Design a protein around this ligand. Structure first.
Ligand code: HSM
Length: 171
């Protein structure tokens, strides 16, 4: 029981999670759009989510990730550090998902629906105590790649899309 884009033979070539994780070491990834409003960590009506990574561990397929975000609870940008590991979901043989672990031990496992060198479309299954939905991440919040944007809009059909990180975040 899994999403129709979760077909490794058809789409695995564009679902390389470890490559996508390591890409966050070189450039900040900004969550430019999502289909859901709340996250247990980032808050309610969260905006302005970005992430950068370091501490690449090839043995573990892990990085350390520093996040920035805003929510309707505080006027100021918030920050958090989490471990992220590339893992397998939906029976894939090559890692296609992100396993985030917070400092308090809370785990979130999201799936790479589509990725290219500077952008990702990530699916949140909604089984972590959170809302099911999609996310669009890009290295440039002003210039959004059409390939990922089209894939996001395709897979996220039937929902309400909203903006998360935009230039307004930097006032
Ligand atoms: N879908 C985002 C899950 C998450 C990871 N870390 C904090 N929240």
């Amino acid at each position: 029981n899994q999403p129709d884009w979760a077909d490794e033979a058809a789409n695995g070539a564009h679902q390389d999670a470890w490559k996508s994780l390591k890409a966050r070491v070189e450039n900040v990834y900004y969550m430019v759009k999502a289909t859901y409003k709340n996250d247990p960590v980032w808050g309610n009506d969260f905006t302005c989510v970005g992430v950068m990574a370091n501490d690449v561990n090839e043995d573990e397929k892990s990085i350390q990730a520093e996040f920035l975000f805003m929510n309707n609870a505080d006027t100021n940008m918030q920050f958090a550090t989490e471990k992220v590991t590339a893992v397998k979901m939906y029976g894939y043989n090559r890692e296609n998902a992100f396993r985030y672990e917070t400092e308090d031990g809370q785990v979130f496992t999201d799936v790479i629906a589509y990725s290219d060198d500077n952008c990702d479309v990530i699916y949140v299954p909604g089984t972590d105590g959170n809302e099911e939905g999609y996310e669009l991440w890009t290295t440039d919040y002003d210039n959004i790649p059409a390939n990922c944007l089209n894939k996001f809009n395709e897979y996220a059909v039937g929902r309400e899309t909203r903006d998360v990180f935009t230039s307004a975040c930097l006032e």
